[PDB]
């Protein structure tokens, strides 16, 4: 079925910019919003962002809005995490997720291994 | 008749943000296309007509475009005062008139997941011969959620009804409450009751639950 | 300023008949086309009904023709529509508007004043009051009250008489399968406050003069 491979992470200075991407391969996935979530260790998860279907838009957690942007690549079936202005507290493991309602319920069913982004 | 189709239905931009509402006719209608704006609970309020005429006393930043089967109306610079239903209306098949089925407009705001609270039946409900089981899902954004109710582990269908507050005015959130309804009988059959809760801000499902009579 | 209101709403069972009356006042109602629209609750606007200045020209939704008629009186500013034959798909808010255009007035065919609109609610439902029951319950706990079985809208709910508002949110009804309406309230509240503050819901229905006080209190 689909496989998630998220990209893009590793060390970086703060005030720094890193890309992360979000590539799946075994489904087309432009029919469905994809999520961005993060876990720094022995802490809960969180939700970052979500890239709703072209044309419906895009949503943001309290701590990434105005740093972070969600972004698509439908052609090449893969979105991205932009992220800009980056401090020590986002260091995290990040993590890409499918939600497999259409209709943006959030049922997250598929989910990347994750990369490592170090902020210090 | 004329069928005119009308997208999106929620509309979700940042105050400042350009937007734009579409409505396209089945057949051509020329110019003669309306618009109106719809406060909750106030009346329809025409904002352009023939297709991209400004009404008097209409702010600048509504304009309409379009000839014939597709239309459009911007607001170059959303205000606070635009969230509200927008329909668009077509004039020259007539009768009957027609309208689009309406876009909602509302202010985006950051992702915040509900909090989640189940409610048993109270005794004084049940002595009475039926059984409502209340699950709350409290201050969240974006508006999209899913419940399901669980008995005794099975998947519930067809015996639940949903209702959705009004976006918050101070803080921009929905909440929603799911009811379950059962005979007093069929409940008193099972033990555990659960309602199962799904939004893009959780990254888990989360479920709250309680066990009858304990 | 112009103006328009709409009168003639209420409950009605369903294959009986109700009249709604527009007053107009403001510009020359004589000289415009107006017409009628509704609202189902929840729903989008539906053109109903129009007629021209002299009555002269009359126009029907394909869902009511047969059974509604619009009328105008202009010697008293009026609009009418007889609404025959009634069913529950029928209920709806009733809005009459007035045209741009009309005689001497070409070229542009808006809506450009609206009444503030009558409900007309088809039902076989009779008057009763709801039934109340407590919803009972981290730092922050809900509470609440379910009320039940009510006919027609609206109930009000407050909290401790109207001294408790903050987190307090009371859902829209529903209309249930049986014709009757439904709705709770709730409220958070610190989770420390429940063993030592006391939370009751007070419901009114007007229409039949029921008033509940129902104390919400733990398991």
């Known amino acids: 079925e689909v496989q998630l491979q998220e990209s893009g992470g590793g060390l970086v200075q703060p005030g720094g910019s890193l890309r992360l991407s979000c590539a799946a391969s075994?489904?087309?996935?432009?029919?469905?919003?994809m999520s961005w979530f993060r876990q720094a260790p022995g802490k809960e998860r969180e939700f970052v962002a979500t890239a709703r279907r072209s044309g419906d838009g895009a949503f943001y957690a309290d701590s990434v809005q105005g740093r972070f942007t969600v972004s698509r690549d439908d052609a090449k079936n893969t979105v991205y995490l932009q992220m800009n202005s980056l401090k020590p507290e986002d260091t995290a493991v990040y993590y890409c997720?499918?939600?497999?309602?259409?209709?943006?319920?959030?049922?997250?069913?598929?989910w990347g291994q994750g990369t490592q982004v170090t902020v210090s | 008749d004329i069928q005119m189709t009308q997208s999106p239905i929620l509309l979700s931009a940042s105050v400042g943000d350009r937007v734009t509402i579409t409505c396209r006719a089945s057949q051509s209608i020329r110019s003669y296309l309306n618009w109106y704006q719809q406060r909750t609970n106030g009346s329809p309020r025409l904002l352009i007509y023939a297709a991209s005429s400004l009404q008097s006393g209409v702010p600048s930043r509504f304009s309409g475009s379009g000839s014939g089967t597709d239309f459009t109306l911007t607001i170059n610079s959303l205000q606070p005062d635009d969230e509200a239903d927008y329909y668009c209306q077509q004039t020259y098949s007539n009768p009957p008139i027609t309208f689009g089925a309406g876009t909602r407009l509302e202010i985006k705001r950051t992702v915040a997941a509900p909090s989640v609270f189940i409610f048993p039946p109270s005794d004084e409900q049940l002595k009475s011969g039926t059984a409502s089981v209340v699950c709350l899902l409290n201050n969240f954004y974006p508006r999209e959620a899913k419940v399901q109710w669980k008995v005794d582990n099975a998947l519930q269908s067809g015996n639940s009804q949903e209702s959705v507050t009004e976006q918050d005015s101070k803080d921009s959130t929905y909440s929603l409450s799911s009811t379950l309804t059962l005979s007093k009988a069929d409940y008193e059959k099972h033990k555990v009751y659960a309602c199962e809760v799904t939004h893009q801000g959780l990254s888990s499902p989360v479920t709250k639950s309680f066990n009858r009579g304990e | 300023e112009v103006h328009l209101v709409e009168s003639g709403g209420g409950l009605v069972q369903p294959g009986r008949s109700l009249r709604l009356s527009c007053a107009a006042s403001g510009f020359t109602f004589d000289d415009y086309t107006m017409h009628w629209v509704r609202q189902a609750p929840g729903k989008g606007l539906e053109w109903v009904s129009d007629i021209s200045w002299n009555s002269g020209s009359i126009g029907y939704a394909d869902s009511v023709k047969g059974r509604f008629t619009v009328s105008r009186d202009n010697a008293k500013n009026s609009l009418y529509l007889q609404m025959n034959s009634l069913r529950g798909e029928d209920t709806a808010i009733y809005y009459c508007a007035k045209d741009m255009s009309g005689y001497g007035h070409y070229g542009k065919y808006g809506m450009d004043v609206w009444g503030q609109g009558t409900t007309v609610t088809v039902s076989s439902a009779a008057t009763k009051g709801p039934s109340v029951f407590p919803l009972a319950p981290g730092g922050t706990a809900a509470l609440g009250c379910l009320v039940k079985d009510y006919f027609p809208e609206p109930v009000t709910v407050s909290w401790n008489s109207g001294a408790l508002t903050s987190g307090v949110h009371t859902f829209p009804c529903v209309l249930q399968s049986s014709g009757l309406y439904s709705l709770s309230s709730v409220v958070t509240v610190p989770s420390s406050s429940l063993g030592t503050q006391t939370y009751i819901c007070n419901v009114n229905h007007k229409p039949s003069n029921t008033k509940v006080d129902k104390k919400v209190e733990p398991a």
């Open positions: 997720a499918i939600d497999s309602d259409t209709f943006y319920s959030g049922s997250y069913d598929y």
């Open positions: 075994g489904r087309t996935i432009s029919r469905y919003a």
